Design a protein around this ligand. Structure first.
Ligand SMILES: [Zn+2]
Ligand SMILES: [Zn+2]
Ligand SMILES: [Zn+2]
Length: 178
């Protein structure tokens, strides 16, 4: 197994996957690494299994169809993995905790959003459809773009949104287009 956490790339108290060489801090894994379970399989392995069990799940999908899916166990897991993929980028630190807004010439968003709030919402099963999760994720970056206006810091929002959107298209097998 790896000697650093797959998500934050630091050593520490790590839990090892039994079916692949990845390792995780307890609360870096999503969901948090389970108390017992021997063997234990990580979220990467659990997602791979879903695909292997239903090869046709990788055929192209319409985003509109994906968004209306109810959050049954498999869709719950996929949103958890997509969240984890965002945390895997070091630039997610800017969007992780609750923001505050006091900049000359800007006003804060009407509905603030951040990754830890989405993490909690997933953990507490507050989303009934994929759309709920995706809307809050996209709101994070849209709030950032609107607030930081012409400051070059706006680009961090563009960058992390691109990681989100690429991983969304991959995980939910969205039909490729030009
Ligand atoms: Zn970690
Ligand atoms: Zn694994
Ligand atoms: Zn099948």
């Amino acid at each position: 197994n790896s000697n650093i956490c797959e998500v934050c790339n630091k050593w520490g108290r790590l839990f090892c996957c039994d079916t692949c060489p990845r390792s995780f801090h307890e609360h870096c894994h999503i969901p948090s690494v389970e108390a017992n379970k021997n063997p234990w399989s990580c979220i990467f392995c659990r997602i791979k299994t879903i695909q292997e069990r239903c090869p046709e799940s990788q055929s192209g999908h319409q985003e509109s169809e994906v968004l209306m899916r109810q959050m049954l166990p498999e869709e719950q897991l996929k949103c958890e993995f997509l969240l984890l993929k965002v945390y895997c980028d070091s630039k997610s630190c800017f969007f992780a905790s609750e923001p505050y807004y006091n900049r000359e010439g800007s006003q804060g968003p009407q509905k603030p959003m951040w990754l830890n709030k989405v993490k909690t919402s997933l953990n507490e099963q507050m989303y009934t459809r994929v759309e709920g999760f995706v809307q809050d994720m996209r709101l994070i970056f849209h709030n950032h773009k609107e607030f930081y206006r012409e400051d070059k810091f706006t680009r961090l929002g563009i960058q992390v949104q691109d990681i989100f959107e690429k991983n969304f298209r991959n995980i939910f097998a969205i039909q490729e287009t030009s």
